[PDB]
């Protein structure tokens, strides 16, 4: 029985439980939480994107990142000892190695870790609740970080590990894509919304109904920790809302079921609208419009201003954002307003 | 011996039921400590302020207060001598060493209640009129406060004018403004682009011929606050809880923290644009100012000039068929200014003397206020949000309208905090419900 | 009672903690480089 | 071993004679640039009038020609147009600048020989990212 | 069309809104 | 409920801790510092020096033209700037 | 007996009526009828609107631009700017139209109606004994409306640039201020981001580990949904049951054992970062944008290295130009 021996080890409930996820999980979760820190503050993708990353550069927190490798690149999984580096740690990291070693990592850990929840769920023995939940982030990571690349041209193209990296990447769909426009993100944008609203109308709504099931005027020593029943009656909660918003629950047991809901929910709408975007298969247009303001220099809406920011967003970002494509834009050639 | 019949932690501080020698010298402990900002800062400002050089290219926020009473003034707003500031700043730190030094009192060794010991130092806040005493009371300390400047403008060394016939320079009020109507009529109109409530102040002396009218209100309050109790009406409604009072003489600050930053972002008098900066709508003017100046000397026409929109190229009429600056600065016609005032007509800019009578002088003023508009960054950057990386300077009139509002707004949701949950003391819900008796369940389920 | 020092908890902290306390004094010596 | 002594080697007059910068007297001329003309002409651009600019090509046709310190020095003096005539100290700040905004004052020989350098040093540094604004950068 | 539909999809939610505030089905306490 | 819980909740208040460790932390610290005042990094990720990024003249950038042998490019871009 | 003011005085704070009608509410509920129905109209048949100065009437609508996703509510005209512009001002409704001065007066009812929503959001919290602090949450939400009705508009030149009410209008009024502020290149704007990043990624928690620990009611026979019959005093859900997994997830200590550590934090985090991006909002009202990084990173010539900051420079100089075009005849936006 020596597999039930390590088996014994590993899910032995220590402090920071490990057991047989942690094989996956912790590893990976590691050389990827790692290689993002170790490029973070060494190395440059001068060798791909001319620009500085590591703070050794000089570069600024926020300025840092990890950025993926040249377009000229393609999707190779750029090993260590693929063809690429040939085996050089140096040249692989010049070559922006580690960004597929910090995304696939990054990825099996974030597999390894929904393991995490289902192995403990089943050990202390709870509805898998949380890992079913996992889906949310573990699609849109796989949408934005998977497909959408392996869909498009090169890993290039894909988000780049750092803040301002990612910050470009809102403004190059507001750019090339027009991805505000999205019905899905517009549910994705929905999810995180309305569930930040319940994270906390739930939130300072408990807080704020629960009883004296204490003695001071602070809350914390109130009755717990499972002990004494409820804090908050849901009735007198409930009445309040039913007058003020109109509408209020009843049945805590769909209110927390309806918040697990909201944002895993919509998020994973817009990581569909992300597929779309790997195939440049994008609400962009509305044709109706385009053909009604073709023939009427007459005929204005939000819809055509911001599409034109999208050029502005384009024409002079593109050239000195994907140098692989040589781009040669002179100054008339340049769109821009009248006196700017 | 707190923490256990004491409520909580974060929340420790509060202790405080009918009285405290602990709170009070902990108010005049702050208090006190607050007036250590005022010199260590003043004497961090003077520790700097170049030679000669724009007061708001360096990040002075202070100085430019002591100047605009008229301390180190300057015909035109230039400091003389790096002086009298130097003495509010180290007053102020040994000010500051008065303030620590008897806090710090009432805070350790300072006699707890204030019953037991004295027995008019001494409080409560269900006291009606001991609290309503006291009001009466720093009412008045500030009734005399609002004469300090009607002295100081009228007596030690007029404020700073740059409404001044030859340009800034203090000047000594000498007519305060004491008609009833124009000073108290002030407040009670005007709220938006027409014109702000008080933001809203053309000349010097409408304001120190006010805050005349203002040292004796509120020093009239104290023997009316000082002298009687609360009326007949006001007994109801207000919670004379002692954390309720925190509230209401708090969330007017919100108030004040809004109405103020209203007032460094607009009022181009009391924040002379010489010591602050150029009020963002100034700098937006002194734009067109610029081109169409650099434009009509190269011989073009502004009269006549018509925009690309096919409006107004340099300028365009008002909803009120006054004459204005085009281009967008057109959102800003309201805004008014010395340098510009003497190129201005009857019907809005005349013109004629904007033709020709265009002086030499307006021309680097109106460019510098172009150049050094009320615009910059996080990281300090002067420049549109993408401006390379080479002026650095952060207009004040920036600071001091982002700071208070920060703070102005917190405040108000401060207000919420206290003047609704000591709404909850005088019911006793402070805590939640009783749960065996709780008001829901005995109600006619609407359904 | 009877502890140990060598404990998974303890190899944990360790892996990400101790490289850290190198990187924020590599870090550290950044802050002067120039040119 | 980047910014070489030949390339802060500038022509310091019109004849063609030349003198050479140190690593050290070129922050001065950026100081006090930053300190001087910051407000205007940032990057090398005169926000007051795009039309002009601090470029190597426009100060050598300017006139007088100003693609050389004493030039560049001359106007740091005395303040004149694009073409000979006009002398524009009565706005445009220079040591003349009849007391007009400070920033003038101060300076001296040492910083108007360097300004004037760090100008046709920067173009030589800054590929022409020096003329043109906005669309660069 | 096209608004017309607009105008519909709309004023159902107000449909939508009357109904569940005031046929709401009580909440029973038991 | 149950907790396998080593020692942890005061180990930093460990008299034989801050000492041992009033030991390692400077050790490791201007360890680090080292790999960095060297110019160590560099050599280690390819890294350049503030003066190492374009040529002491040309203007171009050093961007990978291929895939297969990205490294050969690389090579002579870096031996390039002399 | 009472006199008849008495009776209407208790019908106002009667904590009977279908929804309370609060003293609050008598200024709502005006307010928000006024505003809402003048919209849902405008929305309709809204008259081409003159946003910025220039005689170009650009209006999104449906019986014009009949989209959902186009049209809206179009702003205010420069022209008139921060100015208050009564529709009794207009010498014609038809000229109100131009200026879109229907904007005004519905932005102005839906803001002080909504902050009566704020305010009679209190009324139940003391006209029925509980913590009052439930519309102290909806600060975070009021407020953060205000910083992109009011605010900005005081801030700037006019309510030309006011989130105009609409779908694409919000993106337009995005973008236009990420080209005039680094606004995404902010420590408040992340702050936002640090909540609704949050609040979300937390829902998800509470509503996870809250449904995954719950006893056992039904056995698929129908739902597990049913295992709580409302008015119990019981909690459906355990709560060591349910802090047993995470806790066993992240190590210990790190998953909550108190209930009231649960929950309420459930506000601490969106409402705190909710009002800073507010502000964050707020104060670019004053231009008080976005760090600076643009070259920032140089070199030993001087050559300039390009931060990551550098390119999202471009991404904005982009849209800076061609926003409004047209609308600016100087080289300088100050608003
Ligand atoms: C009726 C008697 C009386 C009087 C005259 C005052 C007066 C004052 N109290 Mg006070 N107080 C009183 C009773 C009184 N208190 C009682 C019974 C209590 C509770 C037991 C308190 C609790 C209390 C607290 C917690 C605080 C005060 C503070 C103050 C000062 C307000 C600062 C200000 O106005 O800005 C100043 C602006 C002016 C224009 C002032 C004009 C100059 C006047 C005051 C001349 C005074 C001459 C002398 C004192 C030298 C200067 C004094 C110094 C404060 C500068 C003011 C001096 C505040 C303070 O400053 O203390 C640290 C404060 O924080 N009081
Ligand atoms: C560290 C926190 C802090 C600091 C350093 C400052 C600093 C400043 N505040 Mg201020 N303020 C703060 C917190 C702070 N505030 C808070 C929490 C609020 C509530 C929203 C305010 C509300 C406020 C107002 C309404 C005003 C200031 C003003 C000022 C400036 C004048 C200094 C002063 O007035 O001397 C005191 C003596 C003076 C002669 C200054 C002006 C005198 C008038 C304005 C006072 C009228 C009563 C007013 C409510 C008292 C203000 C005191 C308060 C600022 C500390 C100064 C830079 C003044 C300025 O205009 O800034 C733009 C101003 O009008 N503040
Ligand atoms: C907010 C205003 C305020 C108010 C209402 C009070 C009120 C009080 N303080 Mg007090 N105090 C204050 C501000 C205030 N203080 C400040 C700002 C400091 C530090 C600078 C102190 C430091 C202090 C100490 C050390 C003590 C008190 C004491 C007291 C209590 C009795 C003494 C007294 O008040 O004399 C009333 C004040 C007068 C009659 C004014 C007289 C002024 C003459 C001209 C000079 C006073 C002496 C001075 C020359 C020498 C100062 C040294 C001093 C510490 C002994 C009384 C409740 C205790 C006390 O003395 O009780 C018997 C006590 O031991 N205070
Ligand atoms: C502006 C005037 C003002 C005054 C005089 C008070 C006074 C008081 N407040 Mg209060 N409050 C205010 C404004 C004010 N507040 C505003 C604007 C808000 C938000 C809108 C609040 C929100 C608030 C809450 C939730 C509570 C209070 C409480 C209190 C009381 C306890 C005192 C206290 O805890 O401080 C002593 C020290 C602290 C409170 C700690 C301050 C330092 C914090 C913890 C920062 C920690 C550092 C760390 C980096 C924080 C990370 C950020 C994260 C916390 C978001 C006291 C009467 C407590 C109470 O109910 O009793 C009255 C309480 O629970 N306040
Ligand atoms: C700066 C603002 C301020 C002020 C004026 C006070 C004042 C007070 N707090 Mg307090 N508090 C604050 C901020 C403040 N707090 C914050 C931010 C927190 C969150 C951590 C707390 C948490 C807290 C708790 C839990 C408690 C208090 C308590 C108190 C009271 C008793 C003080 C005491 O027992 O200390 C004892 C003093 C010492 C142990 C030594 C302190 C050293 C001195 C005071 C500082 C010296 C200043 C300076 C360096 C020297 C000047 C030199 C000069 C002499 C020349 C007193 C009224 C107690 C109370 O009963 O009220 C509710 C209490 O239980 N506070
Ligand atoms: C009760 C809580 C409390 C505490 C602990 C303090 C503490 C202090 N005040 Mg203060 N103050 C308070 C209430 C408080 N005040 C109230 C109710 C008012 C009414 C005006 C003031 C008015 C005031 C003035 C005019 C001045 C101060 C000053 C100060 C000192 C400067 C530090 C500063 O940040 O505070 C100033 C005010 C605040 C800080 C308000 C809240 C801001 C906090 C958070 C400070 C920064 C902490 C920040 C939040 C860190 C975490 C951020 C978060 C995102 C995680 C500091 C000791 C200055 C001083 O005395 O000289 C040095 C000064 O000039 N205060
Ligand atoms: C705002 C972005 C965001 C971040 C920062 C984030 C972070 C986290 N979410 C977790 C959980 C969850 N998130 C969930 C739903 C969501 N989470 C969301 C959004 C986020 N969630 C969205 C909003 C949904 C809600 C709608 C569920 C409910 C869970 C879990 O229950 C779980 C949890 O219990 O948290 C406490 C934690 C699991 C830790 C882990 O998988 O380690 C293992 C992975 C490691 C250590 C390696 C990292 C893997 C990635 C691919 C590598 C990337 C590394 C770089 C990119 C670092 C980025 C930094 C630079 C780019 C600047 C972790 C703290
Ligand atoms: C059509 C139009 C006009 C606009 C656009 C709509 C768009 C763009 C998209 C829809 C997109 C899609 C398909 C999915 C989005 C999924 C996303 C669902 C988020 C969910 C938002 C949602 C459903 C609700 C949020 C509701 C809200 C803000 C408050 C209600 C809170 C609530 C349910 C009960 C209140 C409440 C809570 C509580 O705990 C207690 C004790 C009491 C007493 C209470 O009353
Ligand atoms: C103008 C001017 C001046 C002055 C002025 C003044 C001095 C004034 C005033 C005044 C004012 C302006 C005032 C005020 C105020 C008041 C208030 C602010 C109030 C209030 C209150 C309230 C509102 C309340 C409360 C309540 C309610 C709300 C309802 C019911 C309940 C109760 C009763 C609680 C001068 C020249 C100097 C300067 C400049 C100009
Ligand atoms: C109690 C309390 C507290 C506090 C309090 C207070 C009240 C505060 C503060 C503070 C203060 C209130 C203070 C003060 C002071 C001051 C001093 C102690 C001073 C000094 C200094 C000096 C005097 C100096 C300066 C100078 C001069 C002299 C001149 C010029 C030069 C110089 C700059 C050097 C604490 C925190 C503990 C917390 C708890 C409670
Ligand atoms: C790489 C690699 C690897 C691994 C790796 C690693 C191991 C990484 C790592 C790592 C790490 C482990 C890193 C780190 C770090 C960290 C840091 C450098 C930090 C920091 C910082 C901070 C953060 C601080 C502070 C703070 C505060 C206190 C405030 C706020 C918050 C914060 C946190 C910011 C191998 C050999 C397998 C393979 C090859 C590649
Ligand atoms: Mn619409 Ca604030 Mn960008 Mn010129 Mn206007
Ligand atoms: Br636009
Ligand atoms: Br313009
Ligand atoms: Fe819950």
């Given at each position: 029985?020596?597999?039930?021996?390590?088996?014994?080890?590993?899910?032995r409930?220590?402090?920071?439980?490990?057991?047989?996820?942690?094989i996956?999980?912790?590893?990976?979760?590691?050389?990827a939480?790692?290689?993002?820190?170790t490029?973070?503050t060494?190395?440059?993708?001068?060798?791909?994107?001319?620009?500085?990353?590591?703070?050794?550069?000089?570069?600024?927190?926020?300025?840092?990142?990890?950025?993926?490798?040249?377009?000229?690149?393609?999707?190779?999984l750029?090993?260590?000892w693929?063809?690429e580096?040939?085996?050089?740690?140096?040249?692989?990291?010049?070559?922006?190695?580690?960004?597929?070693?910090?995304?696939?990592?990054?990825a099996?850990?974030?597999?390894?870790?929904?393991?995490?929840?289902?192995e403990?769920?089943?050990?202390?023995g709870?509805?898998?609740?949380?890992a079913?939940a996992?889906?949310?982030?573990?699609a849109?990571?796989?949408?934005?970080?998977?497909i959408?690349?392996?869909?498009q041209?090169?890993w290039?193209?894909?988000?780049?590990?750092?803040?301002?990296?990612?910050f470009?990447?809102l403004?190059?769909?507001?750019?090339?894509?027009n991805?505000?426009?999205?019905?899905?993100?517009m549910?994705?944008?929905?999810?995180?919304?309305?569930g930040?609203?319940?994270?906390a109308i739930?939130?300072?709504?408990?807080?704020?109904?629960?009883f004296?099931?204490?003695?001071?005027?602070?809350t914390?020593?109130?009755?717990?920790?499972?002990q004494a029943?409820?804090?908050?009656?849901?009735?007198?909660?409930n009445?309040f809302?039913?007058?003020?918003?109109?509408?209020?629950?009843?049945?805590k047991?769909?209110?927390?079921?309806?918040?697990?809901?909201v944002?895993?929910?919509?998020?994973?709408?817009?990581?569909?609208?992300?597929?779309?975007?790997?195939?440049?298969?994008?609400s962009?247009?509305?044709?109706?419009?385009?053909?009604?303001?073709?023939?009427?220099?007459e005929f204005?809406?939000?819809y055509?201003?911001?599409?034109?920011?999208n050029?502005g967003?384009r024409?002079?970002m593109?050239?000195?954002?994907?140098?692989?494509?040589?781009?040669?834009?002179?100054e008339?050639?340049?769109?821009?307003?009248?006196?700017? | 011996?707190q923490?256990?019949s004491?409520?909580?932690?974060?929340?420790?501080?509060?202790?405080?039921?009918?009285?405290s020698?602990?709170?009070?010298?902990?108010?005049?402990?702050?208090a006190?400590?607050?007036?250590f900002?005022?010199?260590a800062?003043?004497?961090?400002?003077?520790?700097?302020?170049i030679?000669?050089?724009?007061?708001?290219?360096?990040?002075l926020?202070?100085?430019?207060?002591?100047?605009?009473?008229?301390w180190?003034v300057?015909?035109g707003?230039?400091?003389?001598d790096?002086?009298?500031?130097?003495?509010?700043?180290?007053?102020?730190?040994?000010?500051?060493?008065?303030?620590?030094?008897?806090?710090?009192?009432?805070?350790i060794?300072?006699?707890?209640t204030?019953?037991?010991?004295?027995?008019?130092?001494?409080?409560?806040?269900?006291?009606?009129?001991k609290?309503?005493?006291?009001?009466?009371?720093?009412?008045?300390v500030?009734?005399?406060?609002?004469?300090?400047l009607?002295?100081?403008?009228?007596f030690?060394?007029?404020?700073?004018?740059?409404?001044?016939?030859?340009?800034?320079d203090?000047?000594?009020?000498?007519?305060?403004?004491?008609?009833?109507?124009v000073?108290?009529?002030?407040?009670?109109?005007?709220?938006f682009?027409?014109?702000?409530?008080?933001?809203?102040?053309?000349?010097?002396?409408?304001?120190?011929?006010?805050?005349?009218?203002?040292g004796?209100?509120?020093?009239?309050?104290?023997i009316?606050?000082?002298?009687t109790?609360?009326?007949?009406?006001?007994?109801?409604?207000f919670?004379?809880?002692?954390?309720?009072?925190?509230?209401?003489s708090?969330?007017?600050?919100s108030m004040?923290?809004?109405?103020?930053?209203?007032?460094?972002?607009?009022?181009?008098?009391?924040?002379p644009?010489?010591?602050?900066?150029?009020?963002?709508?100034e700098?937006?003017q002194?734009?067109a100012?610029?081109?169409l100046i650099?434009?009509?000397?190269?011989?073009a026409?502004?009269?006549?000039?018509?925009?690309?929109?096919?409006?107004?190229?340099?300028?365009?009429?008002?909803?009120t068929?006054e004459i204005?600056?085009?281009?967008?600065?057109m959102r800003?016609?309201?805004?008014?200014?010395?340098?510009?005032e003497?190129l201005?007509?009857?019907?809005?800019?005349?013109?004629?003397?904007?033709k020709?009578?265009?002086?030499?002088?307006?021309?680097?003023?109106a460019?510098?206020y172009?150049?050094?508009?009320?615009?910059?960054?996080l990281?300090?950057?002067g420049?549109?949000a993408?401006?390379?990386?080479?002026?650095?300077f952060?207009?004040?009139?920036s600071?001091?309208?982002?700071?208070?509002?920060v703070?102005?707004?917190?405040?108000?949701?401060?207000?919420?905090?206290?003047?609704?949950?000591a709404?909850?003391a005088?019911?006793?819900?402070?805590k939640?419900?009783?749960?065996?008796?709780?008001?829901?369940?005995?109600?006619?389920?609407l359904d | 009672?009877?502890?140990?020092?060598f404990?998974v908890?303890?190899?944990?902290?360790?892996?990400?903690?101790?490289?850290?306390?190198?990187?924020?004094?590599?870090?550290?010596?950044?802050?002067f480089?120039?040119? | 071993?980047?910014?070489?002594?030949?390339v802060?080697?500038?022509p310091?007059?019109?004849?063609?004679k030349?003198?050479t910068?140190?690593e050290?007297?070129?922050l001065?001329?950026?100081?006090?640039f930053?300190?001087?003309?910051?407000?205007?002409?940032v990057?090398g651009?005169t926000?007051?009038?795009?039309?002009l600019?601090?470029?190597?090509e426009?100060?050598?046709?300017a006139?007088?020609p100003?693609?050389?310190i004493?030039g560049?020095?001359?106007?740091?003096?005395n303040?004149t147009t694009?073409?000979?005539?006009?002398?524009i100290?009565?706005?445009?700040?220079?040591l003349?600048?009849?007391?007009?905004?400070?920033?003038?004052?101060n300076?001296?020989e040492?910083?108007?020989?360097?300004?004037?350098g760090?100008?046709?040093?920067?173009?030589k540094?800054?590929?022409?990212?020096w003329?043109?604004?906005?669309?660069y950068? | 069309?096209?608004?017309?539909?607009?105008?519909?999809?709309?004023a159902?939610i107000?449909?939508?809104?009357?109904?569940?505030?005031?046929?709401?089905?009580?909440?029973?306490i038991? | 409920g149950?907790?396998g819980?080593?020692?942890?909740?005061?180990?930093?208040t460990?008299?034989?801790?801050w000492?041992?460790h009033?030991?390692?932390?400077?050790?490791?610290?201007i360890?680090?510092?080292?790999?960095?005042?060297?110019?160590?990094?560099?050599?280690?990720?390819?890294?350049?020096?503030?003066?190492?990024?374009?040529?002491?003249?040309?203007?171009?950038?050093?961007?990978?033209?291929?895939?297969?042998e990205?490294?050969?490019?690389?090579?002579?871009?870096?031996?390039?700037?002399? | 007996?009472?006199?008849l003011?008495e009776?209407?005085c208790?019908?106002?704070?009667s904590?009977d009526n279908?929804l309370?009608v609060?003293?609050?509410?008598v200024?709502?509920?005006?307010?928000?009828?006024a505003?809402?129905?003048?919209?849902?109209?405008?929305?309709?048949?809204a008259?081409?609107?003159?946003?910025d100065?220039?005689?170009?009437?650009?209006?999104?609508?449906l019986?014009?631009?009949?989209?959902?996703?186009?049209?809206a509510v179009?702003?205010?005209?420069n022209?008139?700017?921060?100015?208050?512009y009564?529709?009794?001002?207009?010498?014609?409704?038809d000229?109100?139209?131009?200026?879109?001065?229907?904007?005004?007066?519905?932005?102005?009812?839906?803001?002080?109606?909504?902050?009566?929503?704020?305010?009679?959001?209190?009324?139940?919290?003391?006209?029925?004994?509980?913590?009052?602090?439930?519309?102290?949450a909806?600060?975070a939400?009021?407020?953060?409306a205000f910083?992109?009705?009011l605010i900005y508009?005081?801030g700037?030149?006019?309510?030309?640039?006011?989130?105009?009410?609409?779908?694409?209008?919000?993106?337009?009024?995005?973008?236009?201020?990420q080209?005039?502020?680094?606004?995404?290149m902010?420590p408040?704007?992340?702050?936002?981001?640090?909540?609704?990043?949050?609040?979300?990624?937390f829902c998800?928690?509470?509503?996870?580990l809250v449904?995954?620990?719950?006893?056992?009611?039904?056995?698929?026979?129908?739902?597990?949904?049913?295992?709580?019959?409302?008015?119990?005093?019981?909690?459906?859900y355990?709560?060591?049951?349910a802090?047993?997994?995470?806790?066993?997830?992240?190590?210990?200590?790190a998953?909550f054992?108190?209930s009231?550590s649960?929950?309420?934090?459930?506000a601490?985090?969106?409402?705190?970062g909710?009002?800073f991006?507010?502000?964050?909002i707020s104060?670019m009202?004053?231009?008080?944008?976005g760090?600076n990084?643009n070259?920032?990173?140089?070199?030993?010539?001087?050559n300039?290295?390009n931060?990551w900051?550098?390119?999202?420079?471009r991404?904005?100089?982009?849209?800076?130009?061609?926003?409004?075009?047209?609308?600016?005849n100087?080289?300088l936006?100050?608003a």
């Amino acid at each position: 029985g020596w597999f039930d021996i390590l088996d014994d080890w590993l899910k032995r409930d220590r402090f920071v439980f490990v057991g047989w996820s942690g094989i996956l999980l912790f590893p990976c979760a590691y050389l990827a939480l790692g290689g993002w820190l170790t490029g973070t503050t060494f190395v440059t993708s001068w060798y791909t994107h001319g620009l500085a990353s590591s703070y050794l550069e000089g570069c600024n927190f926020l300025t840092v990142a990890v950025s993926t490798p040249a377009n000229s690149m393609g999707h190779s999984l750029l090993l260590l000892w693929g063809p690429e580096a040939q085996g050089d740690f140096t040249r692989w990291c010049q070559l922006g190695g580690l960004w597929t070693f910090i995304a696939l990592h990054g990825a099996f850990g974030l597999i390894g870790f929904m393991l995490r929840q289902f192995e403990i769920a089943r050990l202390v023995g709870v509805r898998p609740y949380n890992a079913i939940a996992f889906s949310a982030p573990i699609a849109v990571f796989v949408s934005v970080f998977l497909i959408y690349p392996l869909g498009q041209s090169s890993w290039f193209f894909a988000p780049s590990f750092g803040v301002a990296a990612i910050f470009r990447f809102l403004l190059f769909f507001q750019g090339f894509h027009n991805w505000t426009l999205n019905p899905f993100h517009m549910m994705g944008v929905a999810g995180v919304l309305g569930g930040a609203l319940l994270c906390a109308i739930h939130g300072a709504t408990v807080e704020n109904t629960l009883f004296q099931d204490g003695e001071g005027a602070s809350t914390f020593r109130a009755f717990n920790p499972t002990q004494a029943e409820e804090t908050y009656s849901m009735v007198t909660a409930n009445r309040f809302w039913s007058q003020i918003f109109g509408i209020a629950f009843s049945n805590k047991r769909w209110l927390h079921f309806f918040m697990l809901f909201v944002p895993v929910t919509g998020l994973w709408m817009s990581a569909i609208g992300v597929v779309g975007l790997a195939l440049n298969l994008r609400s962009y247009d509305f044709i109706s419009q385009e053909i009604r303001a073709a023939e009427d220099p007459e005929f204005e809406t939000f819809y055509t201003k911001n599409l034109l920011l999208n050029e502005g967003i384009r024409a002079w970002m593109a050239p000195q954002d994907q140098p692989h494509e040589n781009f040669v834009f002179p100054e008339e050639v340049l769109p821009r307003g009248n006196a700017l | 011996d707190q923490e256990s019949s004491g409520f909580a932690w974060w929340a420790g501080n509060a202790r405080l039921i009918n009285l405290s020698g602990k709170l009070l010298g902990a108010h005049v402990a702050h208090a006190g400590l607050i007036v250590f900002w005022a010199g260590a800062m003043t004497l961090f400002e003077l520790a700097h302020f170049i030679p000669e050089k724009p007061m708001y290219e360096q990040g002075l926020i202070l100085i430019p207060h002591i100047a605009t009473l008229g301390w180190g003034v300057g015909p035109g707003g230039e400091v003389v001598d790096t002086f009298p500031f130097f003495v509010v700043g180290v007053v102020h730190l040994i000010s500051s060493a008065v303030l620590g030094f008897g806090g710090v009192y009432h805070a350790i060794r300072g006699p707890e209640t204030l019953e037991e010991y004295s027995s008019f130092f001494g409080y409560d806040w269900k006291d009606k009129n001991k609290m309503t005493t006291i009001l009466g009371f720093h009412l008045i300390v500030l009734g005399i406060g609002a004469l300090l400047l009607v002295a100081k403008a009228m007596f030690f060394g007029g404020l700073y004018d740059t409404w001044a016939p030859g340009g800034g320079d203090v000047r000594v009020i000498t007519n305060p403004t004491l008609d009833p109507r124009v000073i108290f009529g002030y407040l009670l109109k005007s709220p938006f682009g027409g014109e702000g409530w008080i933001v809203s102040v053309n000349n010097l002396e409408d304001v120190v011929g006010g805050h005349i009218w203002i040292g004796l209100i509120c020093i009239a309050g104290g023997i009316w606050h000082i002298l009687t109790t609360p009326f007949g009406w006001a007994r109801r409604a207000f919670i004379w809880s002692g954390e309720a009072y925190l509230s209401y003489s708090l969330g007017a600050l919100s108030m004040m923290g809004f109405i103020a930053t209203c007032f460094v972002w607009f009022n181009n008098t009391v924040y002379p644009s010489e010591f602050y900066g150029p009020t963002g709508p100034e700098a937006s003017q002194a734009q067109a100012m610029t081109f169409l100046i650099r434009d009509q000397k190269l011989g073009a026409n502004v009269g006549s000039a018509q925009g690309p929109t096919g409006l107004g190229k340099y300028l365009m009429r008002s909803p009120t068929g006054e004459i204005i600056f085009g281009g967008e600065t057109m959102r800003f016609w309201d805004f008014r200014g010395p340098w510009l005032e003497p190129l201005r007509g009857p019907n809005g800019l005349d013109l004629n003397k904007i033709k020709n009578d265009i002086q030499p002088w307006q021309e680097r003023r109106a460019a510098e206020y172009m150049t050094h508009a009320p615009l910059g960054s996080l990281n300090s950057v002067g420049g549109v949000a993408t401006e390379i990386n080479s002026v650095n300077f952060v207009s004040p009139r920036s600071w001091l309208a982002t700071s208070h509002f920060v703070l102005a707004f917190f405040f108000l949701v401060g207000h919420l905090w206290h003047a609704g949950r000591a709404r909850a003391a005088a019911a006793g819900f402070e805590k939640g419900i009783d749960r065996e008796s709780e008001p829901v369940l005995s109600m006619p389920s609407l359904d | 009672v009877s502890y140990p020092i060598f404990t998974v908890r303890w190899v944990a902290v360790h892996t990400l903690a101790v490289p850290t306390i190198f990187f924020l004094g590599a870090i550290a010596a950044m802050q002067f480089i120039q040119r | 071993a980047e910014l070489t002594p030949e390339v802060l080697t500038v022509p310091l007059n019109s004849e063609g004679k030349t003198i050479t910068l140190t690593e050290k007297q070129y922050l001065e001329g950026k100081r006090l640039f930053q300190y001087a003309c910051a407000s205007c002409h940032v990057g090398g651009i005169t926000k007051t009038n795009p039309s002009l600019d601090l470029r190597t090509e426009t100060l050598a046709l300017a006139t007088p020609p100003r693609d050389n310190i004493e030039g560049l020095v001359d106007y740091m003096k005395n303040p004149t147009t694009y073409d000979g005539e006009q002398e524009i100290a009565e706005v445009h700040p220079s040591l003349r600048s009849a007391d007009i905004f400070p920033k003038m004052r101060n300076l001296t020989e040492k910083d108007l020989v360097a300004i004037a350098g760090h100008i046709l040093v920067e173009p030589k540094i800054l590929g022409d990212k020096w003329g043109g604004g906005k669309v660069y950068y | 069309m096209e608004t017309i539909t607009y105008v519909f999809i709309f004023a159902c939610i107000i449909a939508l809104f009357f109904f569940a505030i005031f046929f709401r089905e009580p909440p029973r306490i038991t | 409920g149950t907790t396998g819980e080593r020692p942890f909740s005061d180990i930093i208040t460990s008299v034989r801790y801050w000492v041992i460790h009033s030991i390692t932390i400077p050790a490791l610290f201007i360890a680090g510092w080292l790999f960095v005042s060297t110019g160590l990094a560099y050599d280690v990720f390819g890294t350049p020096r503030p003066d190492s990024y374009y040529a002491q003249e040309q203007r171009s950038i050093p961007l990978v033209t291929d895939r297969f042998e990205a490294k050969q490019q690389v090579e002579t871009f870096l031996e390039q700037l002399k | 007996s009472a006199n008849l003011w008495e009776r209407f005085c208790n019908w106002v704070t009667s904590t009977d009526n279908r929804l309370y009608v609060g003293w609050f509410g008598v200024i709502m509920i005006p307010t928000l009828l006024a505003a809402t129905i003048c919209f849902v109209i405008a929305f309709i048949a809204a008259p081409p609107v003159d946003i910025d100065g220039i005689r170009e009437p650009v209006s999104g609508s449906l019986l014009y631009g009949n989209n959902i996703i186009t049209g809206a509510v179009v702003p205010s005209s420069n022209a008139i700017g921060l100015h208050f512009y009564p529709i009794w001002e207009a010498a014609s409704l038809d000229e109100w139209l131009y200026n879109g001065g229907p904007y005004q007066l519905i932005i102005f009812h839906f803001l002080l109606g909504a902050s009566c929503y704020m305010g009679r959001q209190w009324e139940l919290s003391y006209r029925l004994g509980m913590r009052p602090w439930i519309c102290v949450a909806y600060s975070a939400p009021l407020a953060s409306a205000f910083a992109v009705f009011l605010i900005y508009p005081i801030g700037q030149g006019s309510f030309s640039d006011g989130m105009p009410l609409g779908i694409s209008g919000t993106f337009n009024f995005m973008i236009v201020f990420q080209a005039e502020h680094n606004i995404l290149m902010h420590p408040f704007h992340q702050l936002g981001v640090a909540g609704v990043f949050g609040g979300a990624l937390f829902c998800a928690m509470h509503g996870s580990l809250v449904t995954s620990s719950l006893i056992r009611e039904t056995t698929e026979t129908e739902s597990a949904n049913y295992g709580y019959k409302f008015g119990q005093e019981e909690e459906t859900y355990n709560i060591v049951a349910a802090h047993g997994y995470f806790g066993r997830l992240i190590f210990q200590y790190a998953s909550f054992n108190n209930s009231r550590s649960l929950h309420f934090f459930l506000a601490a985090w969106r409402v705190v970062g909710v009002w800073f991006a507010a502000l964050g909002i707020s104060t670019m009202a004053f231009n008080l944008n976005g760090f600076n990084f643009n070259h920032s990173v140089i070199d030993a010539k001087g050559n300039v290295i390009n931060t990551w900051a550098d390119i999202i420079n471009r991404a904005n100089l982009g849209m800076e130009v061609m926003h409004e075009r047209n609308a600016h005849n100087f080289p300088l936006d100050l608003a």
